[PDB]
């Protein structure tokens, strides 16, 4: 009857923002009391749904996401603003039900020098759509004179070397972010607790 609610939070390694991994949740029990009282989740601010009392409520087709961002863009992942992360990497819809619970992960995701395992997408000619995974890494063209596979002038790669440094500020440390998108439907629910 139990299901891996801990696997999505305590996973081995999360994916990047440009390749965020989506996971379907089915046949679970809503034991969110032990999640809110974990004393490790820094930002539990949930928009639309109260942080507590989630156990006396259960949805139909809840999903899950996983990515890592910087501390300054922790506020960027929200249906209230955009510009750098919710504009090319991963944007949440305006009618999103859930939250972006995240914690400081500056203990196993950073190393001396440059951590090039995680990356993010740079500026693009087009705007990102809600719930879109842009796996393609085509060379961005900033206008005329198409390079067509060459780097240099106005043809920088969309992915950028992140460079997770061990010593950083409060807004420059790694932060593992998980998104619990509640899909409110009318079908008989499958993930419902006590």
């Amino acid at each position: 009857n139990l299901c891996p609610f801990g696997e999505v939070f305590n996973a081995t390694r999360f994916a990047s923002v440009y390749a965020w991994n989506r996971k379907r949740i089915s046949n679970c029990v809503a034991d969110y009391s032990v999640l809110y009282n974990s004393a490790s989740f820094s930002t539990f601010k949930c928009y639309g749904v109260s942080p507590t009392k989630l156990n006396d409520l259960c949805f139909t087709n809840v999903y899950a996401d996983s990515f890592v961002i910087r501390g300054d863009e922790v506020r960027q992942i929200a249906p209230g603003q955009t510009g750098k992360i919710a504009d090319y990497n991963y944007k949440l819809p305006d009618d999103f039900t859930g939250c972006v619970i995240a914690w400081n992960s500056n203990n196993l995701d950073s190393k001396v020098g440059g951590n090039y395992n995680y990356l993010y997408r740079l500026f693009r000619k087009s705007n990102l759509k809600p719930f879109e995974r842009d796996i393609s890494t085509e060379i961005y063209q900033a206008g005329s004179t198409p390079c067509n596979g060459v780097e240099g002038f106005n043809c920088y790669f969309p992915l950028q070397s992140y460079g997770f440094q061990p010593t950083n500020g409060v807004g420059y440390q790694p932060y593992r972010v998980v998104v619990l998108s509640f899909e409110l439907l009318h079908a008989p629910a499958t993930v419902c607790g006590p």
Partner: antibody, heavy 120, light 107 residues
Framework: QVTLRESGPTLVKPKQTLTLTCTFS??????????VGWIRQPPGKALEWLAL???????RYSPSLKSSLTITKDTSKNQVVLTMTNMDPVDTATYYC????????????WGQGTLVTVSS | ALTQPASVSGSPGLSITISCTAT?????????VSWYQQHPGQAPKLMIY???KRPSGVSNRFSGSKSANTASLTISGLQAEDEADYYC?????????FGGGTKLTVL
């Protein structure tokens, strides 16, 4: 538990290639944020980190010894091989290989360390 | 590289503190720092891994603090353990520094 012990040659001639290893046990290498290091200390001096390896085979070296110090890994036999050339008399020191459990905890477990001298 | 005093002394039963500053700009914010009570003869050992948090098992009263860029090692009235040295190590921008050696001689 986590135990580190060095094994290999001790005496070496100048202008050679030293191969120092240390067999680890009691823990895994593919753990998130895990890795082993290598630190030396001349008699009567402080410590200086030479190089280390990570879970994703990331060979980070020292800026002064970037070319010589090359570190490898072998998860099948739980062995770590350190290759470095140009044996100099200033390199005469004891070499401890450490264990980096996480990025927060700096070198939790250490090893016994062997006194590798560089002379004639 | 980090700078710390040459050799701090003190009488038994009293309280002492070893300092460790960050004159060099290698550290970005001096977030992670750790000390090593290197018992002279066999190998160093960890006594405090974080700035203030100490590892389990080998810990009685050791602690530490840091205000802006200078670390510290606050010892209790216990000075009769041995003639142990201490090394402050932290992450730099490109390497792993260890500072110098401070022979903590007790009277």
């Amino acid at each position: 538990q986590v135990t580190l012990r060095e094994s290999g040659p001790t005496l070496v001639k100048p202008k050679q290639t030293l191969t120092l290893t240390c067999t680890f046990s009691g823990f895994s290498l593919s753990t998130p944020g895990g890795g082993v290091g290598w630190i030396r200390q001349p008699p009567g001096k402080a410590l200086e980190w030479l190089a280390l390896i990570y879970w994703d085979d990331d060979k980070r070296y020292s800026p002064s010894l970037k070319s010589s110090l090359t570190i490898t890994k072998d998860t099948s036999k739980n062995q770590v091989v350190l290759t470095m050339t140009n044996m100099d008399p200033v390199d005469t020191a004891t070499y401890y290989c450490a264990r980096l459990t996480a990025a927060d905890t700096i070198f939790d477990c250490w090893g016994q360390g062997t006194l590798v001298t560089v002379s004639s | 590289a980090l700078t710390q005093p040459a050799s701090v002394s003190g009488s038994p039963g009293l309280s002492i503190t070893i300092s460790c500053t960050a004159t060099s700009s290698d550290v970005g914010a001096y977030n992670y720092v750790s000390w090593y009570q290197q018992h002279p003869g066999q190998a160093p050992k960890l006594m405090i891994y974080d700035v203030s948090k100490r590892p389990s098992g080998v810990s009685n009263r050791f602690s530490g603090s840091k205000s802006a860029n200078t670390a510290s090692l606050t010892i209790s009235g216990l000075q009769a353990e041995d003639e142990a040295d201490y090394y402050c190590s932290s992450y730099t921008t490109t390497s792993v520094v260890f500072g110098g050696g401070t022979k903590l001689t007790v009277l």
